């Protein structure tokens, strides 16, 4: 209950850092998955707007009217989705330094505990196996 009190307390800190790393890694994976989901939908809305005004340009030299409101509703949804898509990119760009510093200090606590006598079974206890 002296030098092991520090080993147990540092091992308790390894838990919390490991929790925070896996909590933010779960958060970062939700954002990247939703980012590529919206960007693909951004791609589709894009070439859907292409064919929307390309039916206008292809049949305006001859002259079918209420189609303009559809392209205006898609252009409205496009930059509204790209807006939330940039915000997703901002949220997970702000996580990359958090994931790195957590992962580095989590490993440093592991090495510190290993150097202080903690065996692999003790490390896996705090790490949740």
């Amino acid at each position: 209950g002296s030098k092991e009190d520090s080993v147990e307390a540092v091992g308790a800190q390894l838990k919390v850092y490991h929790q925070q790393y896996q909590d933010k890694s779960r958060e970062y994976d939700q954002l990247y998955e939703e980012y590529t989901r919206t960007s693909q939908e951004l791609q589709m809305k894009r070439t859907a707007i292409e064919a929307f005004n390309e039916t206008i340009k292809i049949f305006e030299e001859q002259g079918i009217a209420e189609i303009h409101e559809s392209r205006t509703k898609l252009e409205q949804q496009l930059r509204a989705q790209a807006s939330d898509n940039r915000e997703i990119d901002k949220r997970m760009n702000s996580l990359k330094p958090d994931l790195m510093q957590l992962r580095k200090i989590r490993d440093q606590y592991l090495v510190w505990l290993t150097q202080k006598g903690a065996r692999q079974k003790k490390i896996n206890e705090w790490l949740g196996i």
């Binding site: 790195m100 992962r103 580095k104 490993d107 440093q108 592991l110 090495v111 510190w112 290993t114 150097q115 202080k116 065996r119 692999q120 490390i123 896996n124 790490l127």
Partner: protein
Amino acid sequence: ASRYLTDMTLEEMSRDWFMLMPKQKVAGSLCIRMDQAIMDKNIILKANFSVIFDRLETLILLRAFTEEGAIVGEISPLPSLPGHTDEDVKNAVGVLIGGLEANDNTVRVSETLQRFAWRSSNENGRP
């Protein structure tokens, strides 16, 4: 600039290992350990470390593995002491390589270690 490269899994970092003839040297506040009872094998040096300005900044852990996976060496920061510098890590690698090669061991560094702080030039391995 500013990354964190990891060659070792959490198992490889935390795995218990046992030296028969322990030889510990100290380069700065880094603890170099290796088994002198190892001879005539190919050893890879794997390490977790942070980079900055495309140089090595801080070593988290370096361990020496044989082809079969056995840990036979280690460079680690001493827990009771403050940090180390970019040069301290390179000196410790030289101590581990020169000490490991004196027992006819073919020591090789990883690709990421070769990118920021390598040594050797390597010799021949025995079948």
